[model samples]
Target chain A: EEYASAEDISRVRAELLTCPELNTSLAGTIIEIDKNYAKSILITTSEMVADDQGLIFDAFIFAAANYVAQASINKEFSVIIGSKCFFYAPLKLGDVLELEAHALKKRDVKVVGHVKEIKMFEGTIQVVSTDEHIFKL
Target chain B: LEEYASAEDISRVRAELLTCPELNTSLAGTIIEIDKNYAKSILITTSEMVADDQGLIFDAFIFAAANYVAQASINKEFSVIIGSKCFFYAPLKLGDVLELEAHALFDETSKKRDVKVVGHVKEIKMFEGTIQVVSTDEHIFK
Candidate 1:
């Protein structure tokens, strides 16, 4: 789905408020959220991008997806177990990324982030990568 | 054959990681020992650089261990990381020397292979994971 309903958005927003650790690590603002849809924007600062690190690596991208997927669900525990990541392009410094995550499946202790997108550049926002993150809740 | 590989040969193995710039930047360490099937390295986690908010090492560092091992196994300049299944057991603190080891498992069918990496501090295991890598021609990154 491209967009989410108002009720679903509010539900995810409320649940996201409870995950402080995910919030601090991602260091981004939740732009849109729902039971299955989660989107955030981050301005890549010098601190966020390490020296010699040409563009954001898989680690940072996975971390953001983990936070977005964890906040999409209403559960309390969020422990990441596994992930399948793909990098289409590199993200440079001063780049603004629009991170979008969708919950594919949610079981008792496991939640899967099947569709994750990192949109880079402000004027020409493009998909830099996609990942699937699985968490043990 | 149980032949011991020399450092000169291992240097060629370790140089494979440099093809991917991120690996060199994120995993700033010295390879102590390495062979076609086995590899070992040491990393001292930086306080403000690599650690998370809680002063624990980032999960990506463990992922890099797998990358390090996978690169050492093949002669490709760059290998694409297909996926990984990682388990973080104990927390790794800053200033701790993470003793990492990688074991390469080759696949009979294709160029794809599984590389298992384990991280340690002293005698305690901190993280363990497996990475899937393909050769340079098959990889996305140059």
Candidate 2:
């Protein structure tokens, strides 16, 4: 899990976490990273609650999984091509969830999420490197 | 394509979509065309909805808009989405307008429905997927 160099992790962190003019915050914040592995956390806020029932929208949770998936890979400036994720359970306001991502076998990234011991969501994300930042295009 | 639910029922449900615009304005997919098991919606991306400074739009907003069409196409008010198999071909830029076309049908058991949604920008296939949902009078939140 810790095969990648510290310099590599630092570079990834700078690339992934640097947001100068983003309108809103990214879904999760990276706490750890290594070769083909990334761990992040997403805290659901009241603004994310879509319904009166206090259920957080599906996109926010899925975005957290996507963020972790991108973090685990080696591509510095890659964009998502696709994903297939299943919601195992509902997410509520003020719920803090963990995302564990594993980039395995080249171009295939798997991510699982949990609130404590309860599994909340799981997904696979596909990405391809452009070698350049999207804004440069 | 298949006629399981009535167009009137789907139309009625679309008028009262549950997704909030205040949360994700990019997710306010407008339903221009709808039928018993089909719906066509559109969303225009704005700078206020960008994911990063690179002008790349968040993929979840696209999925949310697609989910809105999928859910509206099925004509269910008390349903919950179970899963989504989504595909994104390119990074959506700010100001890119999208068309979300969704078609829904019942599985063999008839308890669960499968909705296939495809997102197109100027005729280019940008996104596509199957969204699964089930009806339950019981609220998953409570």
Candidate 3:
């Protein structure tokens, strides 16, 4: 479902970072959004590094993946309940990651990540949609 | 050449877990129990872990708990999670105490380990997964 207006997109964007993430690229960039599909990007930085070896924190990758998966659904209340993941490599600073997600089935989304087409991680996230706020669930 | 670790050693592991700078120690609450083939921990879903005002949490944080307990089960401080198959049975809420239990086994022939962890809120099942981990003496971040 294509969100109707820039106003609605702004609303989602406002909720995106004000809650905690997306403070100027912290959550990555949304390249495309469509019905049951989305593409996003993350250009890792020095701040994203976890240790002396400059390994980008894995959680950041997951968060970016989560963002695209949720964006694909584009629901007001898409709460993640379960996930299965395959991590194929370690990420480092300056890695430019591209994540793609598909709402392959009802309440389920599949996501894959790449650094220039070298797939590094892929997963399936299961979410529940509710018109009401998730806190009420 | 080795046997199941003693509770005495595992007790130190718990203490060291509380002492570390790992994601498991920071995100998950703490390792309350640990053994050669087992590890148990808890995380009280808090405001800090909230991804949304509606109490939604990112899988990133949740997986930290599962992976941590899995590694702790085998007393491996330095490890990597290669993959996992997981299911979440319930939506967690603010202040929900998520209890995690992990059972680990090693494949000596393959030089790998597999673990299963179940996350529950009291009697309510919240998350379950069979995780694959590979131990490393050298930390990836080092």
Write the number of the candidate with greater TM-score, choosing between 1 and 2: 2
lDDT by residue (tens digit), candidate 3, A7-115: 6453445434222432325457666777888777788776555444666656567767767887888776666767778888868777888899999724788999998
Model 3 regions lying over 4 Å from their true place: A1-31, A43-52, A56-59, A134-137, B1-11, B14-21, B137-142
Residues A27-86, model 1: lDDT tens digits:
444557666566755555554342244444444545554555544553443334444455
Q: How do the predictions measure up, each by TM-score?
A: 0.57, 0.81, 0.76
Q: Write the per-residue lDDT of candidate 2 for residues B83-129, one digit (tens) a residue.
A: 98888877688878887889987454574789999999887999989
lDDT assessment of candidate 1:
0.50
List per-candidate RMSD values in Å.
Answer: 9.3, 6.3, 6.6
The CAPRI classification for model 3 reads as: acceptable
Model 1's CAPRI class is incorrect
Q: In model 3, how well does chain A match by TM-score?
A: 0.80
Please identify which of the two predictions, 2 or 3, would achieve the higher DockQ against the true structure. Answer: 2
**Pick by TM-score: 1 or 3, better one:** 3
Best by DockQ: 2
TM-score of 2: 0.81
Candidate DockQ scores, in order: 0.17, 0.45, 0.37
lDDT of 1 by residue, B39-113 (tens): 776666665333234454544455555555555555354455556666666545656777778787856567777
Candidate No. with top TM-score: 2
Tell me the spans in candidate 2 whose CA falls farther than 4 Å from its real position. Answer: A1-26, A133-137, B1-14, B18-23, B106-109
Look at candidate 1 and give me any clashing residue pairs: none
- TM-score value, chain A, candidate 1: 0.58
True contacts kept of each: 0.17, 0.61, 0.44
